């Protein structure tokens, strides 16, 4: 029904066709696989990385750690929203999280994307449109988005999984999880490579507690 979507699988080919359907007419970015979090595997990732996407199963331990990070970080997260503004939305619909993650990656990298087709989902009211609840509502309600998501999900088709997005913001590796109140702050970083290291370190901490990792890179 309207308020439960089919799950989108972590699959770069499916994701790349999807972002085309969302309105990227000639995408200058693409998703690729990240094969793991060792230095060896990270070296294989193209550079620069604009965003790291992760699908993972929640464990109570991981959820615990996140609660403590949220509680430790309220002040610094508020400061960062002002100092280095970024796009964050809540996820109001179950299983919308692959789309939220892709939205997070794209909308925090508009300068990289290429042309957005006039009239496309990415040109839509939510995309133009502050508060994560309000944006979240509009995304949850966009029937064009829901329909495109369904089609992408089906293309990939043949334990509480969550899909999230890591971006660099003001010298910090930031996790955008639409199922959390606030962005989560992880390691510090100074350049793009150290951001990838910081995202990988956050991921590796949960691996020890399977995972699908992708990266948004230039095409």
Residue numbers in the entry: -2 to 126, 131 to 159, 168 to 218, 224 to 233
Question: Mind quoting what the paper says about this structure?
Answer:
Here, we have purified and characterised recombinant DUB16 from Leishmania donovani, which belongs to the Ub C-terminal hydrolase (UCH) family. DUB16 from L. donovani (Gene ID LdBPK_250190.1) is a 233 residue (25 kDa) protein that is predicted to comprise a single catalytic domain belonging to the UCH family. DUB16 efficiently hydrolyses C-terminal aminocoumarin and rhodamine conjugates of Ub consistent with proposed cellular roles of UCH-type DUBs in regenerating free monomeric Ub from small molecule Ub adducts arising from adventitious metabolic processes. With 100–1000-fold higher turnover rates, DUB16 cleaves the ubiquitin–ribosomal L40 fusion protein to give the mature products.
There are two molecules, A and B, in the asymmetric unit of the DUB16 crystals. This compares with the mass of 25.5 kDa calculated from the sequence, and we conclude that the recombinant protein is a monomer. DUB16 comprises a single domain with an α/β fold assembled on a central six-stranded anti-parallel β-pleated sheet. The β−sheet, with a strand order β1−β6−β2−β3−β4−β5, is surrounded by α-helices, with helices α5 and α9 prominent in their close packing onto opposing faces of the sheet. The active site cysteine (Cys94) is located at the N-terminus of the buried helix α5, with its side chain at the base of a groove. From sequence alignments, the other catalytic residues are expected to be His171 and Asp186 which combine with Cys94 to form the catalytic triad and Gln88. In both the A and the B molecules of the structure of DUB16, the side chain of His171 adopts two conformations. In one of these conformers, the imidazole makes a potential ion-pairing interaction with the carboxylate of Asp169, and the cysteine thiol distances are ~7 Å suggesting that this structure does not represent an active state. In DUB16, it links helix α8 to strand β3, and in the A and B molecules of the asymmetric unit, this 12-residue segment is disordered with four and seven residues respectively missing from the electron density maps. Binding of the Ub moiety in DUB16 would require relatively small changes in (i) the conformation of the α9-β6 and α8-β3 loops to accommodate the C-terminal tail of Ub and (ii) the β1-α2 loop so that hydrophobic interactions with the β1-β2 loop of Ub may be formed.
